[PDB]
Design a binder for this molecule. Sequence first.
Ligand SMILES: Nc1nc2c(ncn2[C@@H]2O[C@H](COP(=O)(O)O)[C@@H](O)[C@H]2O)c(=O)[nH]1
Ligand SMILES: Nc1nc2c(ncn2[C@@H]2O[C@H](COP(=O)(O)O)[C@@H](O)[C@H]2O)c(=O)[nH]1
Ligand SMILES: [K+]
Ligand SMILES: [K+]
Ligand SMILES: [Zn+2]
Ligand SMILES: [Zn+2]
Lengths: 115, 118
Amino acid sequence: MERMDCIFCKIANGEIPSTKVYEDDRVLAFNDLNPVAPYHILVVPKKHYDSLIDIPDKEMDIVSHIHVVINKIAKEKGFDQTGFRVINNCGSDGGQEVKHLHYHILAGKKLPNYE
Amino acid sequence: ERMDCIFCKIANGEIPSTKVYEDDRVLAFNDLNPVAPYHILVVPKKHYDSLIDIPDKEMDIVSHIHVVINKIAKEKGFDQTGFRVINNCGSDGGQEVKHLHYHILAGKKLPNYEAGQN
Ligand SMILES: Nc1nc2c(ncn2[C@@H]2O[C@H](COP(=O)(O)O)[C@@H](O)[C@H]2O)c(=O)[nH]1
Ligand SMILES: Nc1nc2c(ncn2[C@@H]2O[C@H](COP(=O)(O)O)[C@@H](O)[C@H]2O)c(=O)[nH]1
Ligand SMILES: [K+]
Ligand SMILES: [K+]
Ligand SMILES: [Zn+2]
Ligand SMILES: [Zn+2]
């Protein structure tokens, strides 16, 4: 379902404004407020999960659906052939700040390589 | 399978690696050049060049990879401390090895690399 205090529940259900790039009955994709690349898009389920590690194994296909949507967005926006990065930050060490499952799509420039 | 693919050779057991997970579909192994105390690569045994080369109807391999990630996290204890999952797709994504793989980084407070932190 949803969480009353969750900013991404409210963005996903339209109660807080965003710039939407894709929507279906299971997910919303919208531009990040603080982009780190020319494309910085968040893909979220409409159902609230706190984080990846909180999705039961039996429910993990939400992540596959998110990935079908990521590929659709990359093709539509013309960054599939140039390339892109997909990130999930889980919990404290992962750097998660908003506790509602989200995947970052970063594209439109050559991204840094971790060294 | 691809002759020039390091990960096909690691997956079919032709090349040595340090194995973290294996089932009939997926292998996970330590990255040769780790950037965190846990730096694990999770790969299908089947070769796909990249995320965009997976047909929609086969995207369940990504869900299975994520079950594997969570299983490893729970075993190792970084379920509680946190972790990051990364896929690099194509040139600008920084993909080098053109065989679908996910990076798991864990075991330390990770920097926001794409925001410039190291
Ligand atoms: N569009 C939008 N993005 C937000 C809002 N609040 C936070 N963000 C973005 O949400 C992301 C949270 O990612 P995290 O660091 O939790 O992985 C950040 O990149 C941040 O800029 C908001 O109100 N609207
Ligand atoms: N274990 C192992 N990792 C490798 C080998 N060759 C490359 N790698 C790792 O494969 C990763 C590829 O990530 P990419 O940058 O393509 O997303 C790199 O982090 C690199 O260290 C190898 O022979 N063995
Ligand atoms: K998340
Ligand atoms: K890949
Ligand atoms: Zn929420
Ligand atoms: Zn391969």
